Symmetry: C3
Subunit: 153 residues, 3 copies
């Protein structure tokens, strides 16, 4: 099986009175994520990891001027280039709020959008131990990893 | 072959009054990690829970050390029906030099995972003096793991 | 099919006057990368990614040789340890300049250096949303992932 690795990264600034959306889950919080989209740091990092495993460039090469629509269009472009998806793993870095009670909603959103069962989608949460702009609550980071297979039939 | 990718991250603060323990090797040094706070073992553990779709550290573990945790992770990953292909990792530490301690780290990681040494890699990097990492205020580890869901 | 994952990281400070070289592509820009090589963050992170997957240590356990010479020697050692390369994916975090019209040149330098077709090499570019030393333009980062098969069969 012609297996391929992808990896992806995003970051957004956190600012007062904007909504916090992560992995398509809205998380009540007094700060929220600034970007030209709905600033979904997790879905973008996964969208990059899929384009990267497929050697299709990056989101910018695709989408310029919400984040689930983008994730689904990514999956459709990846499938048309002849790949099927093995699994996704990811980490979100946020000093707060606590993300654990939200993670299952994120997994559901990502699995629907990629046409995968739940068991092939993982999301992990981490603080940054109060270090740097992440640990000071000024930004949130996501990292993703994805495994594809180029068919192959 | 139902292959899966796992990736993991950790960071801890460096401070006076703590021993420095990375990959279960104690590295003599005037500073050490705050948290048993082994950044390398924790990152690898998250990467295996990740590849196995079993969530993360916090979802599993609320006196036990980072090696006990890594071995418990292994057992849960194997129970869920997975086999481990290999691990690779990077530790970002401005100082001290980790190179002569790296093979002791690999041995500790391979034993805890039931792997030969040839399926375990650890790498070390400075941060070129940039950021809290480059200023000696913290240490980072990054890991990647490849599993196979049996598939027997 | 004995598949192996590697991952790789590098960072370099940006300083006025010096040349900016990433992925072996020289990018005209008012700042440039310090290091004792030609400090090519992207080539190095890919280099570590390959030594990682092959469990052969890191660039320091191996190494007047530029970063392309190092990447090719990396590839020679990986092949001689009985490995074949499935693919490479990577990200470069640089707040500026735009890397997109340079990305095909990097992919070409890497594919030649790894002896891979273009369709197995991907390079992606991110800003850091003006956060941290990356966001202030005082450094650039590269992340990389690589997939190897130990032959095997
Ligand atoms: N230095 C950079 C940073 C970003 N980019 C491109 O801009 C697009 C959007 O970047 P941000 O999402 O970081 O704003 C990226 O996907 C990449 O296409 C670039 O071409 N050069
Ligand atoms: N923002 C965050 C950060 C961490 N967590 C949970 O807290 C646990 C411990 O996190 P730290 O080790 O980063 O302190 C994590 O494994 C995750 O389970 C969370 O639920 N929301
Ligand atoms: N704390 C550290 C950081 C780097 N190193 C070693 O030094 C080499 C050079 O690392 P840098 O490229 O980050 O300067 C690494 O490949 C690794 O061999 C180390 O042995 N301990
Ligand atoms: Mg980082
Ligand atoms: Zn984004
Ligand atoms: Zn930890
Ligand atoms: Zn470098």
């Amino acid at each position: 099986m012609d297996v391929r690795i992808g990896q992806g990264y995003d970051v957004h600034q956190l600012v007062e009175g904007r909504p916090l959306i992560i992995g398509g889950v809205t998380i009540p919080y007094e700060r929220g994520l600034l970007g030209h989209s709905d600033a979904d740091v997790l879905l973008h990092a996964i969208t990059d990891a899929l384009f990267g495993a497929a050697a299709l460039g990056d989101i910018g090469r695709h989408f310029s001027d919400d984040s689930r629509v983008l994730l689904r269009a990514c999956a459709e472009r990846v499938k048309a280039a002849g790949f099927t998806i093995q699994n996704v793993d990811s980490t979100v870095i946020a000093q707060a709020p606590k993300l654990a009670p939200h993670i299952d909603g994120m997994r559901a959103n990502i699995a629907a959008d990629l046409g995968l069962p739940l068991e092939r989608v993982n999301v992990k949460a981490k603080t940054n131990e109060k270090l740097g702009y992440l640990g000071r609550g000024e930004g949130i980071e996501a990292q993703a990893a994805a495994l594809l297979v180029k068919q192959g039939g």
